[PDB]
Design a binder for this molecule. Structure first.
Ligand SMILES: [Cl-]
Ligand SMILES: [Cl-]
Lengths: 245, 246
């Protein structure tokens, strides 16, 4: 059973496609505005629901980084059916999957837009839960770090402790893949972010092999930027980035 | 399954002070045997485990994970705690990343650690592109015996099983992120020249741990599998010295 509001978005338009990925404990709700923005400009758009997300925390507890990378591949194949040119964007772990897909399939994307990508969590407490034989099954949730007032994210209200190692793994693999990324990149990072360190944007800008790259700092959003004050700016810049690459 | 000849674990019961000795990815206890026997002849209780999927077949290793390997280190820690009041841990490559992981994960538990050429950051795009690759082969060419001393052989698999690669990187990253939590005394042993794991890994550890007592020992005459190499004697001697003094 899919929680209401967490369903995936598949829209068919032109032969230019965009893959949009949400992050860890979240769902396609956090990406909907953006996804809709691209479909409305006429692009084909795949915004998958990642395995164990938008259902229950227990399901997520049993999900892995192999599932999630397979979800991105499956969405790339859906786009390659409909499309000649692909872009990918994503929030947080979705932004790490974006970097991962572009390093993994270096010739396949015309461009990427990672947003607050979670390559390095830099958290000793989080690392101390990855393989803790004495840890609770769940902690309090990671959701709704948003500057704009009265705005809600559909995400689990808790963090499933067995899934934590898989977040850290996707980030690590994406960081090591950075020099293999060569497509144009628009790296969007919140200047203040209380979930993923802002330095991740510099990390990406400084490590990729792309010759065409820009680091765009968001001044009016925290972590969930795609639902925040800068959501419209993200859409505008990303539409211009698509149009020009 | 049958354990390969030479790949048997080493367990030795001795005093109230114990040492957990961990080998690395595609390797086996044989690469740690010289060190482990040394600590046992000195009278210490010694656990040198055979990691899940290792010293059997590359197919069994393909089915083994980082949850398996950290659970192996946890059970060796439990075996030592039954027999011992004080614990140390040492290990080579992924076993040295596991040594960092256990000292960060259980910060009061160890009196000291000696990671050797610890594999926290492989810094290899080619490896990272095998981690979740839907088109990769089942096996690659092996990583075994990067050894400066001529003639010396390591008992490690002759191939790298591709699916196990994601777990190597996971352990290294979790260890790296735990570094500020490592507080016990540390002897970080690193080969100055290493064709497997970047040498800068020793600096990374030295600079990131919270330990007030720490030493970086650079090995001038060994490559990666230093526990088998020209500097093996120096490593045993300084590790025994480190144990007596902490
Ligand atoms: Cl995330
Ligand atoms: Cl290793």
């Amino acid at each position: 059973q899919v929680l209401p509001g967490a369903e995936p978005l598949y829209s068919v338009g032109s032969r230019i496609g965009v893959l949009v990925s949400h992050g860890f404990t979240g769902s396609p709700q956090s990406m909907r505005f953006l996804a809709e923005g691209f479909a409305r400009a006429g692009y084909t758009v795949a915004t998958p629901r990642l395995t164990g997300h938008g259902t229950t925390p227990a399901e997520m507890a049993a999900s892995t980084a192999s599932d999630w990378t397979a979800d991105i591949v499956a969405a790339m194949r859906w786009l390659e059916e409909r499309c000649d040119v692909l872009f990918m964007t994503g929030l947080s772990m979705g932004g790490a999957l974006t970097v991962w897909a572009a390093g993994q399939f270096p010739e396949r994307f015309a461009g990427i837009m990672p947003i607050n990508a979670a390559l390095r969590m830099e958290s000793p407490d989080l690392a101390a839960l990855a393989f803790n034989p004495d840890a609770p099954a769940e902690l309090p949730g990671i959701g709704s770090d948003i500057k704009a007032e009265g705005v809600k994210e559909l995400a689990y209200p808790v963090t499933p402790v067995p899934a934590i190692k898989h977040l850290i793994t996707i980030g690590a693999v994406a960081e090591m893949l950075l020099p293999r990324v060569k497509c144009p990149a628009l790296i969007i990072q919140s200047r203040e972010d209380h979930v993923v360190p802002p330095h991740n944007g510099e990390l990406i800008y400084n490590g990729i092999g792309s010759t065409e790259k820009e680091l765009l700092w968001l001044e009016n959003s925290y972590h969930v930027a795609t639902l925040d004050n800068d959501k419209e700016l993200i859409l505008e810049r990303s539409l211009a980035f698509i149009r020009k690459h």
